[PDB]
Structure 1
Amino acid sequence: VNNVWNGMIGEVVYQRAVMAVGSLTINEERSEVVDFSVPFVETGISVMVS
């Protein structure tokens, strides 16, 4: 928000803690700011309907 990152990405970008092991999805803006490693689980957008 207003070019002020928060969350895990914010913590990584503010030099507070390297690495962000967790459930983080690769995107474009994030990859523009904070670079990722190779994906280890494939995923995407999907819908459940009961």
Structure 2
Amino acid sequence: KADIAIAPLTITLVREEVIDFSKPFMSLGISIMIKKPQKSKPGVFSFLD
């Protein structure tokens, strides 16, 4: 149904067994997403901070 796929498709072993793949154009990994640490109300701990 298609000729070539240019899309972020994950290169796995089970996809290699049916179709072929080229060299990777962009490497990546699993990272940590947290919010940006803003100012928090310190309280009583600011007496001897």
TM-score (norm 2): 0.55
Unaligned runs of 5+ in 1: 1-15
Once the two structures are TM-superposed, the CA of residue 44 in structure 1 deviates from its matched residue by 2.5
Matches within 5 A, 1:30-41: 30-41=15-26
Work out which of the two has the higher radius of gyration on C-alpha atoms and give 1 or 2.
2
Which letter does structure 2 place at the counterpart of 1:45?
Answer: I
Q: Per-residue displacement from partner, 1:9-48 (whole Å, max 9, x unpaired)? A: xxxxxxx111110111111100111111111000123332
More helix by share: 1
**Amino acid of the structure 1 residue aligned with 2:8:** S
| % identity of equivalent residues | 49
Name the structure, 1 or 2, with higher relative contact order (CA <8 Å, separation 6+): 1
CA RMSD of superposed structures (Å): 1.3
Scaled by the length of structure 1, the TM-score of the pair is 0.54
Alignment partner, residue 8 of structure 2? 23
Aligned length: 35
